Design a binder for this molecule. Structure first.
Ligand SMILES: Nc1nc2c(ncn2[C@@H]2O[C@H](COP(=O)(O)OP(=O)(O)OP(=O)(O)O)[C@@H](O)[C@H]2O)c(=O)[nH]1
Ligand SMILES: [Mg+2]
Length: 166
């Protein structure tokens, strides 16, 4: 068995970029993902099956098909997209309301930190209302997917949540 991780977030957030940076160590050219991409990533001797599911609004209903048995959620946010940060919050809270996910741990990637007007992790925390969450293991990590910055730190937390020993 591997650890089942669902990676979701609005379209353009950087999910597919993150998946292939994590898996392949390269920055891949993408198009908006119509279905899903999937790879198993090994980190510190723990294997994570990461489901990168398309975030275009039209296909957001399909996220629910991936909730079952999910152990960890990676919610990717475009930290430069102030106009849509409340929409990101709404989608996150709609997902967190699901009983199926009540035990899932939540890693938020505050992505695109390379952009000069990016909101930082503290700001994104406020905008997503993370501090109000109850009975939820959660962590927010500032990242730049293209440079790799912050990714392994996110994985450190996620691996620690899901593993029970060295
Ligand atoms: N500046 C900047 N751009 C990024 C970063 N991460 C991803 N991108 C760019 O953002 C755009 C969208 O990235 P994707 O990975 O396709 O986004 P997605 O979340 O998979 O989008 P959907 O497939 O629609 O769900 C691409 O042009 C990426 O190169 C980042 O850290 N900084
Ligand atoms: Mg994609």
């Amino acid at each position: 068995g591997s650890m089942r991780i669902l990676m979701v977030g609005l379209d353009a957030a950087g999910k597919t970029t993150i998946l292939y940076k994590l898996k392949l160590g390269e920055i891949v050219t993408t198009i908006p993902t119509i279905g899903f991409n999937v790879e198993t990533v090994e980190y510190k001797n723990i294997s994570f099956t990461v489901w990168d599911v398309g975030g275009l609004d039209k296909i957001r209903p399909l996220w629910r098909h991936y909730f079952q048995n999910t152990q960890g959620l990676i919610f990717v946010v475009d930290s430069n997209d102030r106009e849509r940060v409340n929409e990101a919050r709404e989608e996150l809270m709609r997902m967190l309301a699901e009983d199926e996910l009540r035990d899932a741990v939540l890693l938020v990637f505050a992505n695109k930190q390379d952009l000069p007007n990016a909101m930082n992790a503290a700001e994104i925390t406020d905008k997503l209302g993370l501090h109000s969450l109850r009975h939820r293991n959660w962590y927010i990590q500032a990242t730049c997917a293209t440079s790799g910055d912050g990714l392994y730190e996110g994985l450190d937390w996620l691996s620690n949540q899901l593993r029970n020993q060295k």
